[PDB]
């Protein structure tokens, strides 16, 4: 009695491999050139797999890097047909705006007049616009220049398209499969008892944020802490909570957009006279909901450390404006809010709305890429934004004297972490249809 | 029997099952196996998938399995690779654990299979010469 090897075809075998994921959408000008993606399947199949304990891990999958590269390529493809806003770097004679300006908003805006080219090359025109203090610098009635003048020039956002983050589904080609972890109490790294094979990712919102995750996916049943190494001080911390808190951001400045002919078919959209009252843009959050969310986060973080230690929340450490303040987009306008009012509480063992001021920056350089900036044109009317916070990015401070009084500060420079709280369930594997299981057959010999 | 609905096991649904249970879900996996930067990347991905399927089909074609999913071979199974009972390797082990168990001997098995099929074709040619 002996055995004989037999080769099998189409057997379920998985191998960790990296592939190129193609985008897909409902296919409903569009935003971020969504026509490049094939239409999605209206009936995505979900196959729950039993008796499987496949390993899952974050900070190593190529899906986050692929999404980052795809966002960069889509951004470049969207900004390529737009008009290059290169010749406005001139001597801008700026004065301060005192038209019913408040005490806090004083000095933020500057009325600048300059000579701009027109459709005819041999003629120029004296035009006036309004620029924020963050977009102009002084050169030694004064003269100012744009912040991106000594840096590489950049284009402007075309008003035909908007920055709406429509959901996108990342689907793998033939010969690859996508596995998701359906465990509600799924750890940051470890085996998942409930694995499900899915056609491709669910509606993923490509939101842009640097301090607080918003418009993302909510938790299953409770708060969860994710990190590649909890004991590592330099490693980022991603906290996700089930009940979202609503934030109401407003830009009460009723500015008027003005079109300036700067050449053949080139229109520069500048900020005209702001009619009505002027006030600083700001966001509001509920005090009770934020306190409850902070308490739940503290309770969930206390199990990772000792029950007798205390934890204090501090503001941003410093650096550039990209990471020291919460930067986001609403109605095409970029907001930079000072979140020092939220992380100003301590936690010891055992009419009601918080307001935080925000600044508007026109010369925006997203994706932390030196050069290749983007001029955000002004939006007519009062900008009203409503959002739900679905997570935060915390960072533990150094030192840690006697493992007590742990201070957490917001942060996060790279945008990959913004998607690490969304693509953590999903993973891609390569299927191997080859098997060599033996049996007692011999085959008809000739 | 006019309103009978037919449903089969899903794609990769027999991964956690036994060897014998997953042995009848090969056809579903076999049939489910198959602006310039986006087009070239998706085209390269599709071409790579087609080339991988072509390589697998050629690997089964050089052996005595030109088309059939289940096929035997006259070469025996040595106990150096895996010395396990047939009563428990087919009813108490999945394809993942079994593939990870002998993943170091796949190249040796493939090489012996190809040389055995080559000598089998030579023997068949010599037998037909009578």
């Amino acid at each position: 009695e002996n055995l004989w090897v037999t080769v099998y075809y189409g057997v379920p075998v998985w191998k960790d491999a990296e592939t190129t994921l193609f985008c897909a959408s409902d296919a409903k000008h569009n935003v971020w050139a969504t026509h490049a993606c094939v239409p999605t399947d209206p009936n995505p199949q979900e196959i729950h797999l039993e008796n499987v304990t496949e390993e899952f891990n974050m900070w190593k999958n190529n899906m986050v890097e692929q999404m980052h590269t795809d966002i960069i390529s889509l951004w470049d493809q969207s900004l390529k047909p737009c008009v290059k806003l290169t010749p406005l770097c001139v001597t801008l004679q700026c004065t301060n705006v005192t038209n019913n300006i408040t005490d806090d908003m004083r000095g933020e805006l500057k009325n600048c007049s300059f000579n701009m080219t027109t459709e005819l090359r041999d003629k120029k025109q004296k035009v006036y616009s309004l620029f924020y203090r963050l977009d102009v610098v002084q050169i030694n009635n004064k003269e100012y220049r744009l912040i991106n003048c000594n840096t590489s020039a950049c284009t402007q956002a075309c008003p035909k398209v908007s920055f709406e983050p429509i959901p996108i589904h990342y689907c793998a080609p033939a010969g690859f499969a996508i596995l998701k972890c359906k465990d509600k109490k799924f750890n940051g790294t470890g085996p998942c008892p409930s694995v499900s094979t899915v056609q491709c990712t669910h509606g993923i919102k490509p939101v842009v944020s640097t301090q607080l995750l918003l418009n993302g996916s909510l938790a299953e049943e409770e708060v969860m802490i994710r990190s590649e190494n909890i004991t590592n001080n330099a490693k980022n911390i991603l906290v996700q909570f089930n009940t979202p808190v609503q934030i109401n951001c407003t830009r009460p400045n009723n500015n008027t957009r003005k079109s300036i002919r700067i050449g053949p078919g080139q229109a520069f959209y500048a900020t005209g006279d702001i009619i009505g009252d002027i006030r600083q843009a700001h966001c509001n959050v509920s005090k009770a909901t934020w306190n409850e969310t902070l308490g739940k986060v503290v309770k969930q973080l206390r199990k990772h450390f000792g029950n007798n230690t205390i934890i204090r929340f501090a503001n941003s450490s410093g650096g550039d404006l990209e990471v020291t303040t919460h930067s986001f987009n609403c109605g095409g306008e970029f907001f930079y809010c000072n979140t020092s009012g939220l992380f100003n509480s301590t936690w010891i063992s055992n009419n009601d709305s918080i307001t935080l001021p925000c600044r508007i920056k026109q010369i925006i350089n997203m994706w932390q890429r030196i050069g290749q900036c983007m001029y955000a044109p002004p939006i007519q009317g009062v900008i009203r934004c409503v959002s739900n916070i679905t997570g935060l990015i915390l960072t533990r401070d150094g030192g840690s004297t006697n493992s007590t009084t742990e201070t957490f500060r917001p942060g996060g420079g790279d945008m990959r972490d913004n998607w690490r709280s969304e693509l953590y369930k999903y993973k891609v594997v390569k299927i191997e249809p080859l098997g060599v299981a033996p049996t007692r057959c011999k085959r008809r010999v000739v | 029997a006019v309103g009978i609905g037919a449903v089969f096991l899903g794609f990769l649904g027999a991964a956690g099952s036994t060897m014998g249970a997953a042995s009848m879900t090969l056809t579903v996996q076999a049939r489910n196996l198959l602006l310039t930067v986006w087009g070239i990347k998706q085209l390269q991905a599709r071409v790579l998938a087609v080339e991988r399927y072509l390589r697998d089909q050629q690997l089964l074609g050089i052996w005595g399995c030109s088309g059939k999913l289940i096929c035997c071979t006259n070469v025996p199974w040595n106990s150096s690779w895996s010395n396990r009972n047939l009563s428990e390797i087919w009813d108490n082990m999945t394809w993942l654990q079994w593939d990870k168990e002998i993943s170091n001997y796949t190249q040796i098995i493939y090489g012996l299979l190809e040389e055995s099929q080559n000598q089998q074709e030579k023997n068949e040619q010599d037998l037909l010469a009578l």
Partner: antibody
Amino acid sequence: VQLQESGPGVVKPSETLSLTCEVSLHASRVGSYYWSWIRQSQGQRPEWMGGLYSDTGNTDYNPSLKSRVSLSRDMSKKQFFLNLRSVTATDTAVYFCVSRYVDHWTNRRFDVWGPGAQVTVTS
Amino acid sequence: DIQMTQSPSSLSASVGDRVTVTCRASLDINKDLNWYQQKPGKAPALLIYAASTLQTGVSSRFSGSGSGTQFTLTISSLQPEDFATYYCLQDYSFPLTFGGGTKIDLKR
């Protein structure tokens, strides 16, 4: 795998009656099901109105009520509707939504029947 | 259409009785018939499918026999929970029709 019916329990006469049945598909199963509607009056034998498939949608209606019955379905929200225009007093019965599908993996018929909803036609 | 015949309508039987229910068809059905049991306030449940195979989850006491236009349901040992209405449904071709019903109660 369970089925459930939903809709107005009490309806007025002469208008179109709409019923919705939610389906609980079997986990890790791909293929085609056969959804059908069967009503049963009080103290009377049940009556089958129509049926349809899940992948092709081939609707089969009873010749005695083909001019009023209408079966529709959608995979977007995974639901199937039943419409019966010009309801009469004889339409007062308990409606049931059934799903017939034979699982080739276990060789079982899986004849599941919903609890049914009582529909009364009166003014 | 197709008429479904079934006999009898109501009959008396005791616990552990050997009882059969007949069911006839207007045309040729061969073996595409199923037996259903319905209780007051409950949905019908499948008992015997294809006139010869026992459905999973059902007791082995129920049995079916017959072919063509004749069908018969047989009980080996009657039990008190079997007191319900029984129906015979054809599945050879459309439309789907049921029988007249058979109610079994305790004999006295």
